[PDB]
Structure formats: structure tokens, C-alpha cells
Design a binder for these strands. Structure first.
Lengths: 107, 107
RNA sequence: GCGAAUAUUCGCUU
RNA sequence: GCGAAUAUUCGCUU
């Protein structure tokens, strides 16, 4: 089960803000496993202003959309474009796609 | 964009029956393309009683769940288990998974 | 863990 | 169109 699945499954709210706050509450603080790389991340935040077509600056300095990144690097097609991105703070943050992340128990 | 994405995108309804009737109305009559095989099917019906863990009798007579079938035959992992199956009548019907089908314009 | 390339064999309505 | 096997080279926080 992916994080995107979890959003449309664990709680259903017709009020958009109530949906966004409850999903934000349910997810922030959970460890997620990416399907394309054996790495785990803590959900620090959910960025509703960004979607899979949003871009980021790579280590080599080139700008690519998340859609482009995961197709090129991992050959993972992001089908849903209306979803937000997950923020993970380390120590720039790692933006994660719900559709590309599994779930885990966490603190 | 997959059919499952479309369900959680095109119309949002807090009433479950109203959601199931409106999705049923929106989808029945559309051509869908499967991502794992270059084949297209008309949506004849949506079976809400069946999910990806439901089974079917193969041509060779062995019974397998849709989850097992698409992992073995096409190596396609169905993440969402709460979704229904799409019915397509030919000329037994072909049961299709929303998560594994793209969208098209159709009559 | 997901993939990419070349080569050779393969599986595929559900 | 999605894959499977063997072999050889590879890419990978975002």
C-alpha cells in the first residue's frame, strides 16, 4: 500500500481543508519506504503547493520535475498529478511522492 | 493517469452510495488501456463486491487472485486493495484493475 | 531496492 | 505494451 492509497482510504472528508489537516496529522511523523530505492524517510511535512510536475535543483545544478526525475533515474511513472509531495528534513529537504512510498510504523 | 486516480479525482462524495453511482455513471462506456499489455477494453460494469484479492478461474483451470495474476504474469504490483474491479463483456468477462488501466475517450 | 544498455532464450484475454 | 531468465557493463538523497 502506498501513501497516496492511504490518503483516499484511511479518512474521507468532503471538506478540503478538513481533509488536508487530517491527512497532515495522520502522516507527519511516519516512516515511509520508497519502492524504487531501499531507503526510509520520516514525514516532516506535507507540501500541498507542490505536485509531481514541480521541479527541484539537482546536485549537478540542473532543474528537473519529479515526473522527469523518477522516469529517468528509476523508471517509475507517476500517474497521479493532483497529489502533494512529502517533505523530509535531514541532518535542502527530500521531496517524496506518496504514490512512490510504502508505509511503516514510526515515532 | 489511471482509473483509480480518476475515482479519487473527478468526483468527491462523502456519501458512499452517491460516490459509487456517480463513478459507475462516469466510467461505464469508456475505453481503457492496460499499462501491462497493449490492449483496450470497454467498461461494461463496475463490480464493487470484488477487490484485487478476489480470484478467477484461468484457461488452464487454476484459481488465482488478481494480486497473484498480475505479479506472476506481468510483474505489476497492485498496491491498493480497497478498489473494485472493472467488468468488460466480449463477443467469461475480463476483470480489470483501475490501478492498472489508463484512460481514453470512448462511446 | 528500482531500473538502463547489448546479446541470447522466453511468458502473456481474464 | 508489461515483464522473466542467463551473461556482461552501468545509473541512483531530492
Amino acid at each position: 500500500e502506498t501513501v497516496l492509497d492511504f490518503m483516499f482510504n484511511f479518512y474521507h472528508q468532503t471538506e478540503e481543508h478538513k481533509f488536508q489537516e487530517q491527512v497532515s496529522k495522520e502522516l507527519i511523523g511516519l516512516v515511509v519506504l520508497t519502492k524504487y530505492n531501499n531507503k526510509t524517510y520520516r514525514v516532516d511535512d506535507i507540501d500541498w503547493d507542490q505536485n509531481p510536475k514541480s521541479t527541484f535543483k539537482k546536485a549537478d545544478g540542473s532543474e528537473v520535475s519529479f515526473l522527469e526525475y523518477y522516469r529517468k533515474q528509476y523508471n517509475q511513472e507517476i500517474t497521479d498529478l493532483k497529489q502533494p509531495v512529502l517533505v523530509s528534513q535531514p541532518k535542502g529537504p527530500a521531496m517524496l511522492i506518496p504514490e512512490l512510498c510504502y508505509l511503516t510504523g514510526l515515532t
